[PDB]
Amino acid sequence: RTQSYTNSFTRGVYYPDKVFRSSVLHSTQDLFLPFFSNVTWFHAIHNPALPFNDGVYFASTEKSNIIRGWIFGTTLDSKTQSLLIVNNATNVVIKVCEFQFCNDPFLDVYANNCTFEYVSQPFLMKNLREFVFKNIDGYFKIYSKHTPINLERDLPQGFSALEPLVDLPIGINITRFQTLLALHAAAYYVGYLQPRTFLLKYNENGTITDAVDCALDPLSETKC
């Protein structure tokens, strides 16, 4: 894999709570992605994993739309609730099971204890999709935002504030995680999420406008 390095810019913002506010300057302590972070590409032809540093920020610019999950756990091999977010064209299959996935889990186009079995609408559908995950206080959360991208080069300057998609009632300690393959040639991004604080702007309609990384610049700490 090739790890191209650029800036993550001002992405990864999610809704801290479901209280509808208008023209409110609100600040809070949450665990998420800071501004102007690093970027690790993974474009290749080809399974080593990545450490979970309290959150991952994702971005897929696949026009073919081939991604079927983000597997979490402790040792990644059928140990602590291996999450599978495999999606078909009719629904989504989100389950935690133990199917003994060892290495290279590629899915063709053509067991034990399973606590979760919930099936929802297909979330996955010049497009960009963000899937900020988080684990705080033994809770698991899924976020999603289908922002139509314009340039297929890198992360643009657009704002794609994440709405809370699915909140899980159970959680486990996460240390190792990776990204599922999709073959019969892709490119995605992985960010690191370190605790800093918001400074949120709400417009007249209540949508979340620009935020400020208070722990990034002296100017931004002055703003906060």
Added chain:
Amino acid sequence: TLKSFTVEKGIYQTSNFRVQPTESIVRFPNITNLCPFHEVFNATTFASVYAWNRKRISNCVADYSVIYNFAPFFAFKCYGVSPTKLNDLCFTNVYADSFVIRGNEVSQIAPGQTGNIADYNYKLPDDFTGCVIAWNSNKLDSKPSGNYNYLYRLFRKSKLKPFERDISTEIYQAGNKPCNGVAGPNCYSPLQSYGFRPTYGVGHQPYRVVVLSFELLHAPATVCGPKKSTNLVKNKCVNFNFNGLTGTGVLTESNKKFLPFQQFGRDIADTTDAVRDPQTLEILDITPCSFGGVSVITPGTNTSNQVAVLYQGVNCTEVPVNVFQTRAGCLIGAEYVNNSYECDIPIGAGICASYQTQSQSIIAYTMSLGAENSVAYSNNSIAIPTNFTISVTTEILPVSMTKTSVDCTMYICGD
């Protein structure tokens, strides 16, 4: 207000006027099913302390007055809420963690607690808004050999995070012996079970501690129920019981763009400004109705007894719980006059009042700024006085107040 019996001529502030609420409305989501609060309490056995089970409860009648006699316990260790008014609330979800511990660490199940069994099997958050229901298990769980089914961890490389379950089996490596899978000497496993007897001591007899999560003021609410839902009105001062929120408002309709996940709304100071109706998804602003205060306009008590009443800054279409209307508000008991006198009692924004006979009545009028003058000015217009008036005008100035020394011990304590 003056705490006396003689009242001087002037305007005096008096306590505020408010519109009394007329009706009371209750709007709860239409949930009718039942959930097993009972069946998880008289069960055959509970889970282990390191493997505590968490179960999700939703879409059922939230009855907390029946768990008093579904379980033989002794009161609640509630933090954040209370069991007396628990059935009057309406929140998102409840989780009932349960485990069987020893007796001398029921006090160790608390927020911000450090101990052996506080951090190696089960840990609470720093701010836990729930109740820590606990009772003995001397009859249900007691064996002559010992309770070897329940397990507690003695050794861990790090303390637990709050509300997270660590289920595993391994070999602790505190010693230098590289057994790497042998439970012999110097690398003893943390799988050890405490044992009791029916004839054992009483001070730490085993317990059946059940906690409740009680997440509130967030998300759509689905564990509620034990009251009757009523109708809804608009533009009248009524009391509302929208989920858990209580207050007096008129419930107007506005145009606020709700996101599909949002169920509340606050403006500045944690005051709820817009509540989505739990039955039908729509707009419902919240606004307490009209208010202000009353100001009494009176002459002296020796002079008269009639009064004039101001209502502060409000159109007097609804006066109670002639009439002259200004920007300071309406006046009942005062009659407007088109003249201009040097005014005695200031009334509001621009208007004064006095006491004139033309039976005597309390008139009110716009403020006279003095007699209007049309003083001449041309190229040749000058006034030079031919006489004077040596006048003595008395000016009064305070200089010093009373020197007071306060004995702090005598005043506060009194010898």
Added chain:
Amino acid sequence: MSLGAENSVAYSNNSIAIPTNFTISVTTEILPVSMTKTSVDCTMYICGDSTECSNLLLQYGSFCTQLKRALTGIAVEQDKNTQEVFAQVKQIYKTPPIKYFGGFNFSQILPDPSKPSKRSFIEDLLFNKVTLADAGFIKQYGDCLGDIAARDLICAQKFNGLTVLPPLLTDEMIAQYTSALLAGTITSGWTFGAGAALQIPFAMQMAYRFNGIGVTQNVLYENQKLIANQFNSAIGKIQDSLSSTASALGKLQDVVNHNAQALNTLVKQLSSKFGAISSVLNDILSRLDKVEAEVQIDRLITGRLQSLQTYVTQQLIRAAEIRASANLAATKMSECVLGQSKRVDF
């Protein structure tokens, strides 16, 4: 930093300097006189509508009675400041039909009946520059009833007991006081501050005000057109500065911002727990027991009473500062509007 200039005076045995020319400059000094007259109900702020919080606030004695007495004294003091600054005159004077006031253009400061208010051009620019918060002197409850656009800040101030009392002297009669003072200054001069108005042409009054600074009155009587055009160009410079260069109204816009941010801070302190479990009082009644609930209500009552006492003490210190500035403004109106002042840099 530069300390301003490395100038050296050219002293000698007998080194002198005398000016051969002047500059009639209209220096503009901006002074606060009265602040916003507020009043706190101590039932809608601390308690809102609860009987229990009122019954516990009854145990504290005469705290809010003293608070209401202090705020009533503050409001009466502000009305007294406005009356003793503006109403230096007993009779309202009117402008003559001729506006030729000795060649000095006074159309910018004398009022015109084109607008429905009896205000002036410079007064309109000065009101448009200072962004007033539009408090409860106008009955905004008709606007606060309908939820137009989003919720306003003044509606949130009003709904929590922080009502604003209107001034006794409205802007029209304050402008009438100002126009009477201007007409007495032009037509009567300084002689209306010692009884009744005594008429004088404006050239004579400007001459007799040149005589009060050690200058003979031939200076204007040979150069009336130059002084008149200098006054016109200086008041035009003031007009252009009010139109474009907004860098002079900082004192009064500051005073409005102190009052607005003080009421906003006192409103936003209702979201502070002060060690309680929550800052929503109705959820405290709905959640807790009896005894634990008046324990947390007593914690909120101590916190909000400390916030109200801090607000009242800061408003008392600010009222002392405003009263000192109003005594200075009344001394200026008594001394350098109703007469001529001989004090240097005053």
Added chain:
Amino acid sequence: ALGKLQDVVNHNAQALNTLVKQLSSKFGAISSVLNDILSRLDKVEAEVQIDRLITGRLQSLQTYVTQQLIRAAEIRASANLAATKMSECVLGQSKRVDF
């Protein structure tokens, strides 16, 4: 005519009378008399209630001292004005108009 000095006397008298009346305030305690509290209560709980009354009367005394300090600043300003008027209206003739 003598409203200002009568106002000063009534201000100080009503301030001292309010400080006397504040002794009857409970401040959230079970009573308002120190001997009554020390007569019926225990040691630790009476220490709690006496600390509550101490906090209440200390807040009352701090309000009294702060109000007397603000009023003493006002009285000092009026006394500086009176000393100036003794200096230039009595001991001389002042050219300040409307003074």
Added chain:
Amino acid sequence: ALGKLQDVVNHNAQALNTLVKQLSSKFGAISSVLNDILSRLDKVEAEVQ
């Protein structure tokens, strides 16, 4: 000869010294050093004191 400025300096110095010595006051708690309370009491009694 210079009494008022000495009063100003002494008032500021004694106000700061009073503020320093007010750290030693118990104010109804069990001690005056926060480290001893934080290493002597569990978090409920520690947060009360």
